[PDB]
Design a protein around this ligand. Sequence first.
Ligand SMILES: CC(=O)N[C@@H]1[C@@H](O[C@H]2O[C@H](CO)[C@H](O[C@H]3O[C@H](CO[C@@H]4O[C@@H](C)[C@H](O)[C@@H](O)[C@H]4O)[C@@H](O)[C@H](O)[C@H]3O)[C@H](O[C@@H]3O[C@H](CO)[C@@H](O)[C@H](O)[C@H]3NC(C)=O)[C@H]2O)[C@H](O)[C@@H](CO)O[C@@H]1O
Ligand SMILES: CC(=O)N[C@@H]1[C@@H](O[C@H]2O[C@H](CO)[C@H](O[C@H]3O[C@H](CO[C@@H]4O[C@@H](C)[C@H](O)[C@@H](O)[C@H]4O)[C@@H](O)[C@H](O)[C@H]3O)[C@H](O[C@@H]3O[C@H](CO)[C@@H](O)[C@H](O)[C@H]3NC(C)=O)[C@H]2O)[C@H](O)[C@@H](CO)O[C@@H]1O
Ligand SMILES: CC(=O)N[C@@H]1[C@@H](O[C@H]2O[C@H](CO)[C@H](O[C@H]3O[C@H](CO[C@@H]4O[C@@H](C)[C@H](O)[C@@H](O)[C@H]4O)[C@@H](O)[C@H](O)[C@H]3O)[C@H](O[C@@H]3O[C@H](CO)[C@@H](O)[C@H](O)[C@H]3NC(C)=O)[C@H]2O)[C@H](O)[C@@H](CO)O[C@@H]1O
Ligand code: NA
Ligand code: NA
Ligand code: NA
Ligand code: NA
Ligand code: NA
Ligand code: NA
Ligand code: NA
Ligand code: NA
Ligand code: NA
Lengths: 599, 599, 599
Amino acid sequence: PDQFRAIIESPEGAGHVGYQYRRNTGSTMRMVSDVLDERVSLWDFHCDPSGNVIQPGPNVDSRQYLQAAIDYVSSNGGGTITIPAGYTWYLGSYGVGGIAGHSGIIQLRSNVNLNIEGRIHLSPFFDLKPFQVFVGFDNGDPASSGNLENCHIYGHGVVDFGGYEFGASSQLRNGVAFGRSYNCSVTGITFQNGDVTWAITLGWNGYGSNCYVRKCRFINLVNSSVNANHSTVYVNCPYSGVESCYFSMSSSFARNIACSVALHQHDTFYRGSTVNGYCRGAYVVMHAAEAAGAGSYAYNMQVENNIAVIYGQFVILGSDVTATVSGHLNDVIVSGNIVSIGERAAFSAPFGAFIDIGPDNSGASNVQDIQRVLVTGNSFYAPANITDSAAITLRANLNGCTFIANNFDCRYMVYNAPGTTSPVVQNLVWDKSNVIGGTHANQRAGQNLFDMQFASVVNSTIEVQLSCEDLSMFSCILFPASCQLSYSKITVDSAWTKSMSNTAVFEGNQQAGANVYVSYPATVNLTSYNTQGAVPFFSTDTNYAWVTSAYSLSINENLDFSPPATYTNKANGQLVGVGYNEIGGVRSVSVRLMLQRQV
Amino acid sequence: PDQFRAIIESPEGAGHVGYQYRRNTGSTMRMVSDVLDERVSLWDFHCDPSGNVIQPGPNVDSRQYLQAAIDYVSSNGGGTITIPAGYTWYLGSYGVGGIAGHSGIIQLRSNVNLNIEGRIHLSPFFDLKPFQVFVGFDNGDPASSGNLENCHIYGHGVVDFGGYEFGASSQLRNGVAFGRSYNCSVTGITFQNGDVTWAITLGWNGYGSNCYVRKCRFINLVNSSVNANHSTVYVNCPYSGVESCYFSMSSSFARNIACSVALHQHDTFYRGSTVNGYCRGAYVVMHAAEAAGAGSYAYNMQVENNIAVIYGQFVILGSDVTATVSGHLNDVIVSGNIVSIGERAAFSAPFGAFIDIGPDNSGASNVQDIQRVLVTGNSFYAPANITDSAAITLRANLNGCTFIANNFDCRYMVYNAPGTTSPVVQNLVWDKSNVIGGTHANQRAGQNLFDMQFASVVNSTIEVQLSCEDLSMFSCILFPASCQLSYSKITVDSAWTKSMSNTAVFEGNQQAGANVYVSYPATVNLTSYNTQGAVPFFSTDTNYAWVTSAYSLSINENLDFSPPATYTNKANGQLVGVGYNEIGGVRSVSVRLMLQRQV
Amino acid sequence: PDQFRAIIESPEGAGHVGYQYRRNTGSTMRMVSDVLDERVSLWDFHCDPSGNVIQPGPNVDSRQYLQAAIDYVSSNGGGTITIPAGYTWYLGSYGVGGIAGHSGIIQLRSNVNLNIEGRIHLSPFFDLKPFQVFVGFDNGDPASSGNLENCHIYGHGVVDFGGYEFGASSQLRNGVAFGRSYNCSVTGITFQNGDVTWAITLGWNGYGSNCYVRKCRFINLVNSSVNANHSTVYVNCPYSGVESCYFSMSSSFARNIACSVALHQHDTFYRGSTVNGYCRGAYVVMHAAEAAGAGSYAYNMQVENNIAVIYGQFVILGSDVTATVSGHLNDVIVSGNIVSIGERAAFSAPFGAFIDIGPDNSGASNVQDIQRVLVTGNSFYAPANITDSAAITLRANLNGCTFIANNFDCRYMVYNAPGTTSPVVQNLVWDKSNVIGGTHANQRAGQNLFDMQFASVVNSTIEVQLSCEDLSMFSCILFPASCQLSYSKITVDSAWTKSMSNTAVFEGNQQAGANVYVSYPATVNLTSYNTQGAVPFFSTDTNYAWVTSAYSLSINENLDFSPPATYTNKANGQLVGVGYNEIGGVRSVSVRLMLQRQV
Ligand SMILES: CC(=O)N[C@@H]1[C@@H](O[C@H]2O[C@H](CO)[C@H](O[C@H]3O[C@H](CO[C@@H]4O[C@@H](C)[C@H](O)[C@@H](O)[C@H]4O)[C@@H](O)[C@H](O)[C@H]3O)[C@H](O[C@@H]3O[C@H](CO)[C@@H](O)[C@H](O)[C@H]3NC(C)=O)[C@H]2O)[C@H](O)[C@@H](CO)O[C@@H]1O
Ligand SMILES: CC(=O)N[C@@H]1[C@@H](O[C@H]2O[C@H](CO)[C@H](O[C@H]3O[C@H](CO[C@@H]4O[C@@H](C)[C@H](O)[C@@H](O)[C@H]4O)[C@@H](O)[C@H](O)[C@H]3O)[C@H](O[C@@H]3O[C@H](CO)[C@@H](O)[C@H](O)[C@H]3NC(C)=O)[C@H]2O)[C@H](O)[C@@H](CO)O[C@@H]1O
Ligand SMILES: CC(=O)N[C@@H]1[C@@H](O[C@H]2O[C@H](CO)[C@H](O[C@H]3O[C@H](CO[C@@H]4O[C@@H](C)[C@H](O)[C@@H](O)[C@H]4O)[C@@H](O)[C@H](O)[C@H]3O)[C@H](O[C@@H]3O[C@H](CO)[C@@H](O)[C@H](O)[C@H]3NC(C)=O)[C@H]2O)[C@H](O)[C@@H](CO)O[C@@H]1O
Ligand code: NA
Ligand code: NA
Ligand code: NA
Ligand code: NA
Ligand code: NA
Ligand code: NA
Ligand code: NA
Ligand code: NA
Ligand code: NA
């Protein structure tokens, strides 16, 4: 009797109230508390020392309560803790132990999922300070850290970084660091209102597997001139990636420092996402410094079906070395992306590009080992005023990259700044199916469409096809004398080129090379002998010693004679062909020819 | 004592039964009611005025109860209401207030999600009437409406529209109208058994952001001749889209009126979906009338990796104007789609096409501003009998569209009906890597494969490559005299063309234009002079004044002489070349030549 | 009083404790048990005959309890049963009734979902025995089976097959067989640690619709030499597919027997997945034996945007016949995939290929009807030592396949073993935009890059373009005399071919065919007449009767004369052209020419 009322009102009371599911006589005879025990929320730990629930709010630090919840569920082999809807849960202090070395707030634990339906907000304790909100490392030294496995963060909720600026450029800030992370994911969450280094990082220097970010939103996560660098997701473990996410920034500083994604280990991907307001789209890089967990090669790298408005470069490739490890990047695919450089002044942000072959972080351009890249079926656009826009900026050594069936509408097709680096280039393949747009027609005074500012080019193919005129350009393709060129194929289709003074330019006469295969239009003056009948025409200039055949691209306005349709050369570098004089006389004509060498 | 039993049996009783999670002494001391209060379902509001639960069913109108649930959860800052499995919840009356102007049933509210696990069915009250089942507007005038934010509808449940036909063509019917919608989504739901205008609409005239439809099914949603028009999803806000959905119709009327998706604002996408039984795949359109919320430009438009069997056109492009706004469409990508026209009689449904450049809703063809479109890596097929099948129907002004590396197997490649509209065409690029299939070989009597029925063509490229013979076709490409052609490149590869009478046809001799670059095969009769030795051959006809070079595509069956391998022209329009007479005599030959102009 | 305490402690007690949601006076007056009844878990059925809960574990067989749960929820129109986190639930006996014919453990039922958050593990009762863990058939004969509808398995949980090997090769093992399955799915689950035939199968011989596998992981599911054959997912119903899954194997035996996916009915897809350690990627096949439910045609088949490291073939196409049904495969797309053959010895696994046109299961190569396939925008790589690597192994009759804008870097481009099958080939299209990599340069002694070991080839296109030299290869393309060739286009671009002895080889002189269109480089010796002036040069050999024109690909080192730029032929099979002797004399030269026929 008295026993009973007291029991019922006690914390043990629910364990004395019987329950059987749907009154089914074959079901377990349970107590109410057993069924309530099948789920868990923050409210089950958000209490004072006497067990009284505490309401969250700006003046309550929820950190210790959420940790206690995580720790406890961990102790039972895992489960999912709900962070309730209709409330904002503030975090107001650093965590302790292994995550202190990472400016950690909350420590994640294996098999313990968080279903965030409400909002998590940082309190002003964190203003001008570093922080990493959720950390999966269990040791201040990641090398001595245990793993995080089977940890999923998901829901319709929000992580809000409080708007606080960085205090010093050297500080780091993160949303979720999974650590040495295996089968972990973030799904559905909005990260917003911050000045951070990363929102999410996956893995640690190759350690980890099967980590993903899906259907998340990242909004306004750079806000200050102090922020040194930002990559919204960093993928540092294999068999991991980003899909169907939304990234947006409005800060000016984001246009110069912020990237959406870094893919830094093999078998990783970035797909189906939309980006606006960022400097960069994705890094695809093998850092030798990060090669411990999964080898020294980044391969099976996929960037596909994204939409981007960026201010700098869409995809940036790299590889580098340490004293004892060499990083390699190969087997990459970039496909189906629709990208534009946003409205901006020329040179007002980092040099606009669809692909950038960038130097290492110390600026070295002679360490890279990048090859077997396929860039196909993408579109790129930059507004006509943006002088600093290229399909590819090729600024460090390149061991191969293949372009097929893209549509590039920008200032340059291939570019590298003269004076600067002199890359060694092998296996650069630009197929004829790359369509060159006309937005920048008439803007190219002084400029070469393909500006080949390299140390050397080998085993390469550039097949130039225009789709409209641009008589402002100096040349379609130019090689400076300092660039060696061998075992290559270089062609300029004649369409829309009849009025161009220069089409292809070889400043060191490199097209004469034994295994250079070239064709391009040129104007040539010829003079014939006076013989009636079949009669030779010869070029007045003697700079065609390399030419294997030429043919006419001009009509013949004459009745009494015709120049040759086709020409060979002579040892003195003249062209020669056999035309026809109906009546005799020395002829003199100026004709547009297709010059060919070994093609 | 008496107090206590009564309390326990009262509605407050659960608030007197103590609970502490898993008997953990560090957990909150709560009451059973607190834990039950962490979730909510329709059953918590589906009661009579005395609080007694009401069972749902065909004779119960669940609308007021579901609204009360929504309203209440809204009052606490949101949450997710479950619509329970194992029941069908019928709706049987219109809602009241702001949604009445939209024939609204239920009003959605911000942060209030619906987890539909059971079924929602419309009662016959709605037969022959308009309706919009869930509405996110809060005002009858959308312009005066507040926003809907953070509203997600998801689950394994079903919205069933009762099979009822439309009462009048002018009526509108919708499943979910999110309104001025920000971070809202539908995931997992089946919409079925109706005659509706749309299943889901996202945004309002550019207002909204981050709205998505994912893994939903839309089955049999047009059923009558009354239905004026149908678009299963309409995307009217930016940074939004449709992915991994399934659309199917079985009605004949669907084959003539129904589209799966309309993408009508920037940064929107349609991906990874399967469509069957529809007239159309997707509209990609900027209506000037819809430009208020997000500007007058639709850009970053993506249709990718879909599978479709349709009866009309797969992708339809458009832009139009109002008295004060002009709509523009640019930066579109259409890629990876596999599409076919379903089995049907020729002309039995709207003209079959992979891409359609359509006029505005009033039929105007001189208002459009469509450019920077990339169509790449798609397949298209129509059965051999379907005369009305084209890769592109180009029926209104076009400012650019690029085709690369597609496989088109239908009746026409480029088409527009003669007599009808006369589009102004710029920057139409058909790369040589488009593979033209052979299904319609032998069906093309009287027909031009590329039928260029335009006012004019400029800055365009058509590179024709056959992969099999079709000697039934009148020509590979024809330009009527009314079509101007300038600054263009038009080529017909010779393969499978040796027996064609006409390859390329320029009915106004437009290929003579100063900046027209063309090549195609032709048969030419020549006659030589009688001279032994090097000897000229000249064409008998004088219609080659435009030709810059030609070369032989025929073997020489003669021993005693050979015609020229290559030819130029003469001012009188003859071709001329130098052959060789081993023995003298006037020769007369008929030879297949590749005619070239400026290429 | 005494009544009351006893009631409260009874299993009916929760039904006597009142509850009203959030104390809202407008909410339903319910009892605690009603709210608890909104959810259900295994714990509600995992009890002994007296209703006492039983803890799971290795010595407890949970099968009967889970079945009872399923059966009961089925009886109420469905719902979702949770399999709780933090526990491993072992299965230790076969089920009974309709699923016994399928070695069934658990029987799935319509509208009854499983949310697996914990782990399901097979007990050693199943060692060396067949089993199918979840079965949706309700009859031992699938033909007499009812349907399974609206059944979803999802969660962060795990199905673990216990590591047990197969007992005999003839046994079958499966994870989830949905049966005649309509709107069923598996999402999020890890399947691991087994030796099984399939992890998941969808549909039955065409019966079923809208079945999907998404975000699942399949890890180490083949482990023994006994395992006859493995396909991780088998898709045997239309409008179904696999997306965003992860497949990995470590067994040697997997490298020879295991495929990730079989797509075997129309409108099916495989996308966005990562594969490692498998022999094969996907089968795309129409078995006549499986044509009952959805017709005899597999069409709208999509393999897109996958990443794979395999040891055999990536995509395998097929179709076959029975006494009364003929299977057809058409309208396929393979796009955006990045694939490599993993490190292995030559010939150590089945012949490496990106695409394989395979014979039927009995080895027949003359039954297939495969056409309208598009292979575009993929990358493929095999290490240089793997002799048995091809872009396409074409081993059975082919009615069409189109390749555009791929990047293939392996030993062969087109291959079939000589001696073996002699396929009939139609409509094989290899566009010039396929980039041929250089990894295998110098490895090709004795080998033809395109080895055309067929009965016949018709309506085909091979446009060979090299991007680097490989002087080790015997030829770029070879046709044996036994292969007929007609109505085809075969071209070898000259770049990187100047030093090749053979470019294209027609061992039966098939290039002479009336409708064969060919061009390739050759070296030709010529001798002139002694005449000063315009002078003929003629070839010394007489094997050019088929040549329509040739032109020089060599420079002219002479001052006193030049050979012809262009050549025709003569009836005796000599080439002839008109050059120029500045001074007279018989000349003799050896020149590299582009030989052309009808192009
Ligand atoms: C913002 C960004 O990612 N930018 C990349 C650039 O990345 C390099 O520079 C960034 C600058 O923020 C990182 O370097 C900073 O952080 C590392 C790591 O922090 C330490 O280790 C982590 C595990 C721990 O939690 C922290 O408390 C720190 O102790 C510092 O070592 C370094 O001094 C500092 O400048 C980035 O480092 C990588 O970060 C990822 C994600 O957290 C880790 O998984 C890696 O271990 C770590 N790498 C290294 C080498 O330490 C630098 O790699 C790229 O180099 C460039 C090419 O893609 O693109 C962007 O600019
Ligand atoms: C079915 C379809 O979408 N077809 C498109 C076509 O769309 C135009 O025609 C359809 C015909 O159904 C729509 O026009 C009808 O509906 C509008 C909107 O209804 C009113 O406003 C909404 C907000 C409110 O809830 C309703 O109660 C109404 O008050 C009517 O104004 C119009 O008279 C009527 O014919 C479609 O209108 C658009 O609908 C979307 C989705 O609901 C709204 O977000 C837009 O505001 C509204 N646009 C306009 C201009 O009002 C018409 O745009 C396309 O034009 C064509 C090209 O893609 O393809 C299909 O045929
Ligand atoms: C592993 C794999 O799928 N390999 C494919 C290959 O498939 C053929 O061979 C496999 C070998 O395992 C299957 O054949 C075996 O299984 C069938 C089906 O089992 C019976 O029916 C099912 C419904 C029931 O549950 C079981 O108890 C059995 O009664 C046996 O009939 C056959 O004797 C046995 O060798 C595969 O059969 C298909 O399996 C799918 C998935 O379960 C079913 O939906 C189909 O009905 C069944 N097909 C047939 C014809 O019975 C065989 O098709 C492919 O042929 C090949 C080309 O893609 O690739 C792989 O090698
Ligand atoms: Na640190
Ligand atoms: Na490549
Ligand atoms: Na140099
Ligand atoms: Na209205
Ligand atoms: Na374009
Ligand atoms: Na005109
Ligand atoms: Na069986
Ligand atoms: Na094809
Ligand atoms: Na033969």
